[PDB]
Design a protein around this ligand. Structure first.
Ligand SMILES: *[C@@H]1O[C@H](CO)[C@@H](O)[C@H](O)[C@H]1NC(C)=O
Ligand SMILES: *[C@@H]1O[C@H](CO)[C@@H](O)[C@H](O)[C@H]1NC(C)=O
Ligand SMILES: *[C@@H]1O[C@H](CO)[C@@H](O)[C@H](O)[C@H]1NC(C)=O
Lengths: 108, 157
């Protein structure tokens, strides 16, 4: 339950220059001091070449802790993004948690 | 490198329930205060804790700032704790910074926090008495369960 972090991806392989989104869902016991953000090859998303972006971290206070959600949207699936080590990062004062996804591996 | 995200207005209290404040000489000190009247909760006691995302994730990286006539930010330059007249920046190109602390949960005290310097690994913000002052200093960790480096952060937003 909490803490927790899970990344989901499309089951069906996306063709070259296709579109897709990656879902990152976390839980943190810290309602205020917790963040969620994506990295690609260790870089902020807004620093990467290509057509991609992350949405806002939505936050919902449940009974197990606080759920954080953030989408990474890939507008055009190029070879470079297909081979990128995307990483969803949850951070709060107790721990750092990461989950990594490389599309080329997942579909291989 | 760091990028700034959201900020939380915060009253920071030491182990004796005294409140952090920025004094007339930019010294970080602590003072007694009651929880009943907010005219007591003066501008110099209302801190802005800004969270940063990190390219090398290692902890809850934060700056601690306060809004008076001008904005001031806590620094540990040269291992001394001071307030610099500057706004916390949107980006920091380094992996460490004299204004970036890692805010860490105290493992056996669920609602308490410690602040570790990113510049000086193993050094923490701490409260120490000198004369009639209760000072915020930087201390190398030397004692398990040291209560002098533990703080309560009360959200005020
Ligand atoms: C995919 O997009 C790239 C860049 O615009 C282009 O070089 C390539 O021809 C495109 N592929 C197809 C099948 O159109
Ligand atoms: C991510 O790293 C891989 C491996 O070096 C590379 O193939 C890919 O182009 C990188 N992605 C970007 C956006 O640079
Ligand atoms: C992706 O990046 C992380 C860096 O934290 C690393 O631990 C992981 O093994 C990487 N995966 C691949 C396939 O490179």
């Amino acid at each position: 339950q909490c803490p927790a972090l899970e990344v989901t991806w499309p089951e069906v392989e996306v063709p070259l220059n296709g579109t897709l989104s990656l879902s990152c869902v976390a839980c943190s016991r810290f309602p205020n001091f917790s963040i969620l953000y994506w990295l690609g090859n260790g870089s902020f998303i807004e620093h990467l070449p290509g057509r991609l972006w992350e949405g806002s971290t939505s936050r919902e206070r449940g009974s197990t802790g606080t759920q954080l959600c953030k989408a990474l949207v890939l507008e055009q699936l190029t070879p470079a993004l297909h081979s990128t080590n995307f990483s969803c990062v949850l951070v709060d004062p107790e721990q750092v948690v990461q989950r990594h996804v490389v599309l080329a591996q997942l579909w291989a | 490198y760091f990028g700034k995200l959201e900020s939380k207005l915060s009253v920071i209290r030491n182990l004796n329930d005294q409140v952090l404040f920025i004094d007339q000489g930019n010294r970080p000190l602590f003072e007694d205060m009651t929880d009943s009247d907010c005219r007591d909760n003066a501008p110099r006691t209302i801190f802005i804790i800004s969270m940063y995302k990190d390219s090398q994730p290692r902890g809850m990286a934060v700056t601690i700032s306060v809004k008076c006539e001008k904005i001031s930010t806590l620094s540990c330059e040269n291992k001394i704790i001071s307030f610099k007249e500057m706004n916390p920046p949107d980006n920091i190109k380094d992996t460490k910074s004299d204004i970036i602390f890692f805010q860490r949960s105290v493992p056996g005290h669920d609602n308490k926090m410690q602040f570790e310097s990113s510049s000086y690994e193993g050094y923490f913000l701490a409260c120490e008495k000198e004369r009639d002052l209760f000072k915020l200093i930087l201390k190398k960790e030397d004692e398990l369960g040291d209560r002098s480096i533990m703080f309560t952060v009360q959200n005020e937003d």
